[PDB]
Structure 1
Amino acid sequence: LKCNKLVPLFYKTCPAGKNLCYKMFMVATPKVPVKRGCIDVCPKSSLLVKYVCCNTDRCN
């Protein structure tokens, strides 16, 4: 599995276990991601902070 990094033009291969790609942005600016990478369980989304996760290569 491969996930993108903050900067889309780059990615990394997830380490054993972490079988997910996540995206993290503020509710205010949804199209402006601020965190990118691999993860085990999608972080809980609060009010102003959203977490989006997918299981495909470079989808986050």
Structure 2
Amino acid sequence: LKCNKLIPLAYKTCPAGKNLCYKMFMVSNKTVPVKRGCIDACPKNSLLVKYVCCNTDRCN
């Protein structure tokens, strides 16, 4: 699986153990991402930072 980078054009494969994609959003703008990468296990969402996982290509 591959996930997009911070800038919508670059991407990187999810490392050993990481076969899931995730995105870190901040209350400041839940409509725009703060961080993007891959993850091993789908994380827990927060009130301040919202985490969204996906099992698709260039999902995030």
Q: TM-score range by the shorter chain?
A: 0.7 to 0.9
Q: How many pairs were matched up?
A: 60
Runs of 4+ in 1 over 6 A off after TM superposition: none
Looking at structure 2, the residues matched to 55 and 21 of structure 1 have their Cα atoms a distance apart, in angstroms, of 6
TM-score for the superposition, normalised by structure 2? 0.87
Give the TM-score of the pair, scaled to structure 1: 0.87
- Counterpart mapping for 1:40-51 below 5 A: 40-51=40-51
Q: Which 5+ residue runs of structure 2 have no aligned equivalent?
A: none
Cα root mean square deviation, aligned: 1.1
1:43 CA displacement: 2.1
**Gaps spanning 5+ residues in structure 1: where?**
none
Q: Which has the higher strand share?
A: 2
